[PDB]
Amino acid sequence: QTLNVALYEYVPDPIRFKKAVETEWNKKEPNIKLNFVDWDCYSEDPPKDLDVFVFDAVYLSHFVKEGYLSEIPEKDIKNKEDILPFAMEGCTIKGSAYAIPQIISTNLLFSRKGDYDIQKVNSVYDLYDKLGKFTSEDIILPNNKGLLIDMSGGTSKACMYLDSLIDTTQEYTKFCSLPNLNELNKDAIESLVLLQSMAGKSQANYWPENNDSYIRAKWFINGKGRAYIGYTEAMSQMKEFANDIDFKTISLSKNSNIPIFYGDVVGINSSITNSYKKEKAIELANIITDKNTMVKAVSPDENNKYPQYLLPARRSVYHNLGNKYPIYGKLYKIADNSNNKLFRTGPEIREWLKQAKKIITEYLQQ
Numbered sequence: 001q002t003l004n005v006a007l008y009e010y011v012p013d014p015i016r017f018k019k020a021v022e023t024e025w026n027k028k029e030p031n032i033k034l035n036f037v038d039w040d041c042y043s044e045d046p047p048k049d050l051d052v053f054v055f056d057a058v059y060l061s062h063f064v065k066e067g068y069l070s071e072i073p074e075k076d077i078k079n080k081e082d083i084l085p086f087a088m089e090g091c092t093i094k095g096s097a098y099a100i101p102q103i104i105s106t107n108l109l110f111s112r113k114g115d116y117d118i119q120k121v122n123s124v125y126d127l128y129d130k131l132g133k134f135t136s137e138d139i140i141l142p143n144n145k146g147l148l149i150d151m152s153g154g155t156s157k158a159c160m161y162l163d164s165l166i167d168t169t170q171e172y173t174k175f176c177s178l179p180n181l182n183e184l185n186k187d188a189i190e191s192l193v194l195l196q197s198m199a200g201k202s203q204a205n206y207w208p209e210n211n212d213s214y215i216r217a218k219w220f221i222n223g224k225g226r227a228y229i230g231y232t233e234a235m236s237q238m239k240e241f242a243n244d245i246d247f248k249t250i251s252l253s254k255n256s257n258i259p260i261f262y263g264d265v266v267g268i269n270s271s272i273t274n275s276y277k278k279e280k281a282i283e284l285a286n287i288i289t290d291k292n293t294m295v296k297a298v299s300p301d302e303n304n305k306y307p308q309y310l311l312p313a314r315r316s317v318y319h320n321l322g323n324k325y326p327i328y329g330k331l332y333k334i335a336d337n338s339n340n341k342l343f344r345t346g347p348e349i350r351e352w353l354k355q356a357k358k359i360i361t362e363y364l365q366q
């Protein structure tokens with residue numbers, strides 16, 4: 001007896017997640033084996049035999065439209081009120097939940113403690129007035145000069161453009177219809193141009209030969225650059241120096257930030273029609289998203305002395321972690337603001353991204 005399950009693997013330590021899930025699942029279903037698949041939502045739709053899987057909510061509309069996801073009755077969501085509303089709502093279409101949020105994520109502006117100028121920035125335009133252009137092609141920035149930021153990914157940049165549109169238009173949208181790439185919003189794309197100019201084009205588009213996803217976080221701690229924009233989980237590689245840094249969200253426009261968060265959310269395959277198996281999958285989905293699993297997945301363990309610093313979607317996890325790791329107290333203040341929105345895109349995202357990768361990149365190459 002078996003379930004095929006994919007966890008979200010773009011995290012500092014997916015092994016800690018696997019062990020946490022295995023441990024909590026085994027306590028409840030000692031006679032059902034978990035088959036852990038490496039499945040990549042960014043590359044392809046879920047196979048019919050993938051029973052339970054964690055995916056980026058940008059694909060939610062697509063997955064629901066194609067009918068890949070079973071509805072999850074609200075009574076089948078354990079401790080539902082402990083979940084951050086914007087995240088649960090982001091998983092809810094026309095009154096029905098189609099996923100349970102597990103992780104949320106957003107880019108932060110990181111600055112060094114004592115750098116009051118940077119910490120008072122509200123937007124990338126404020127940041128630019130402070131940093132100016134980095135006009136070198138050096139991948140390695142000078143000490144305390146320039147912006148560290150990873151703009152190497154095609155998909156990431158397209159997503160940044162969407163985020164930029166929302167801050168520029170000052171309207172949150174789920175992009176049921178995705179933007180026209182023949183007529184780019186000049187202001188919104190200007191924000192990406194500015195970011196790249198503060199970083200230098202070479203450093204902005206750099207991917208390291210050793211595939212270290214957090215290399216810029218280490219450079220930053222070592223004194224390279226004036227400021228660093230990256231995800232909260234970058235602090236997982238900052239060691240004790242995480243305590244010597246400040247962080248905040250900033251707007252991609254000259255207007256007030258609409259704080260957009262990626263959601264990594266757990267769905268259950270609609271191909272499951274056997275009600276017993278269906279019950280087991282709903283149980284697994286809750287275990288993947290419950291408090292104890294998240295605490296174990298995120299905290300240090302025998303092989304890892306620092307937290308992952310991923311943002312949970314449950315209040316209770318922050319409370320538990322915040323006693324032991326005070327940075328989580330600060331992260332909670334960012335995570336719990338009622339004006340937070342989950343990053344959603346329409347059903348046709350895959351084709352749009354294909355075209356957008358090329359269009360946004362070539363624009364930024366000028």
Ligand SMILES: Cc1ncc(C[n+]2csc(CCO)c2C)c(N)n1
Binds near residue numbers: 153
């Ligand atoms: C914890 C976490 N961090 C970042 C993202 C967003 N994200 C990660 S990889 C990628 C593009 C393809 O690699 C995007 C958009 C997320 N969903 N979850």
Ligand SMILES: [Mg+2]
Binds near residue numbers: 040043
């Ligand atoms: Mg691929």
Ligand SMILES: [Mg+2]
Binds near residue numbers: 163166251252258259
């Ligand atoms: Mg924003």
